[PDB]
């Protein structure tokens, strides 16, 4: 054939990949502490002899969007929201250290703090709270525990949440949705990120997802139009080859 | 070696195929933000010339080279994009989608026309082979 | 299941579940000692197609 069909076909398939990314972002429009994935087409030119006429296209996800989302006021002392450019630290699935923005902190029957089922990492390893005690979280992450039955004079600090500062260019979303330091950024900032004393959290507010609707809509419209365009070419090439095959006759 | 109209129509078919491939490349990456080295994807075009050999302005078409459009690249606003300049503007391709569609249709019909010319000449010379029966 | 009709179906189902939770909260306003529900969502495993 004329491999021009293999260019428009790639452009049509990567458009479906982009649509699958955008639809995934739209599905998580209500996920607490969600970071939308950025999608971008990139052109790769095929190198070789003769007129460099073929340039294929391949989707690309250049990190995520770090713009803070909405702050819903839920009058719950455990739901916290982070200052912009801030991250909470939890223990990842494989016993590693991961970063998140979901402040929906839950207390188990044994007293351990968890986020989405992952243990919360305190100044010194996971945080264990006295069993069945009221928890208040300060602006700088200090945790006060009140034991029921005892007077409010008993309120004393227990542990401090680890709050780190990381930009978009330094973190990469792992396969389980937890952000981790990129290789270059890890090599310069060390393996574990030191807690920043300047980070401020807000107790009683939960951060929503930063999925922008207007950009999503525009992206879907553009993707549909591009797919239809590539499909026109895929039809042009087909007919042209169908007719060109006649020269092989007589 | 290819003889006369066979050479002419073959050159025309090859150049029309190149034109359609360039149009398809422009139309596929009309929204690409970056290339492999960080530079934007600038729209490509073909340059047509007359084979001519030395003394015959009567030859097929030949694609001298693939030029890159020097028209200013579209600017979009994105200060968070790493590729943005000091002013926060990201360069985006200057592809005219309607122009690319029309170019694809034109390369298609010209390709078909030259195929028909080649077929007619082939039949004519096949019948020439039986001159005098 | 073209991977874009499944992803959006999942979002539609999630929004329907959230609406069901909201309707349950609103219907049980007059009950005694009722604690309101709140729906929490999490994105599933992201698939990696090609490494950076």
């Amino acid at each position: 054939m004329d491999h021009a069909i293999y260019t428009a076909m790639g452009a049509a398939s990567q458009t479906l990949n982009q649509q699958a990314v955008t639809a995934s972002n739209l599905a998580n429009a209500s996920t607490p502490g969600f970071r939308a994935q950025l999608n971008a087409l990139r052109a790769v030119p095929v190198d070789g002899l003769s007129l460099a006429t073929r340039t294929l296209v391949t989707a690309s996800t250049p990190g995520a969007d770090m713009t803070p989302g909405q702050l819903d006021y839920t009058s719950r002392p455990l739901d916290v929201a982070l200052q912009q450019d801030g991250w909470l630290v939890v223990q990842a699935a494989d016993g590693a250290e991961g970063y998140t923005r979901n402040g929906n902190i839950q207390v188990g029957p044994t007293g351990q703090l968890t986020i989405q089922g992952h243990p919360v990492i305190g100044e010194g390893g996971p945080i264990t709270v006295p069993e069945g005690s009221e928890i208040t979280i300060a602006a700088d992450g200090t945790i006060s525990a009140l034991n029921p039955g005892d007077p409010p004079n008993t309120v004393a600090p227990v542990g401090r949440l680890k709050l780190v500062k990381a930009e978009g260019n330094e973190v990469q979303r792992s396969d389980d949705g937890l952000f981790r330091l990129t290789a270059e950024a890890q090599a310069e900032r060390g393996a574990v990120l030191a807690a920043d004393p300047s980070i401020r959290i807000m107790s009683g507010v939960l951060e929503g997802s930063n999925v922008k609707p207007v950009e999503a809509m525009t992206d879907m419209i553009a993707n549909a139009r591009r797919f239809e365009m590539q499909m026109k070419v895929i039809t042009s090439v087909d007919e042209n080859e169908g007719r060109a095959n006649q020269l092989l006759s007589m | 070696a290819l003889l006369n109209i066979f050479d002419i129509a073959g050159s025309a078919l090859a150049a029309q195929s190149k034109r359609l491939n360039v149009a398809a490349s422009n139309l596929a990456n009309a929204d690409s933000v970056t290339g492999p080295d960080g530079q934007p994807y600038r729209a490509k075009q073909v340059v047509f010339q007359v084979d001519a050999a030395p003394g015959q302005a009567t030859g097929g078409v030949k694609v001298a080279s693939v030029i890159e459009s020097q028209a200013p690249e579209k600017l979009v606003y994105e200060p968070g994009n790493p590729l943005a300049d000091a002013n926060g503007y990201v360069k985006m391709p200057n592809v005219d989608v309607v122009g690319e569609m029309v170019n694809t249709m034109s390369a298609s019909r010209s390709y078909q026309a030259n195929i028909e010319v080649l077929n007619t000449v082939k039949s004519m010379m096949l019948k020439t082979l039986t001159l005098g029966q | 299941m073209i991977s874009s009709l499944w992803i959006a179906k999942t979002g539609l189902d999630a929004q329907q579940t959230n609406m069901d939770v909201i309707a349950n909260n609103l219907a049980n306003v007059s009950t005694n000692g009722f604690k309101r529900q709140r729906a929490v969502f999490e994105d599933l495993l992201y698939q990696t197609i090609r490494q950076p």
Partner: peptide
Amino acid sequence: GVPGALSNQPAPPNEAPIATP
């Protein structure tokens, strides 16, 4: 040489890098 002609040596390998080193 010109496209469509005959050469004495093979064309170089064809590769499309996603990201340049």
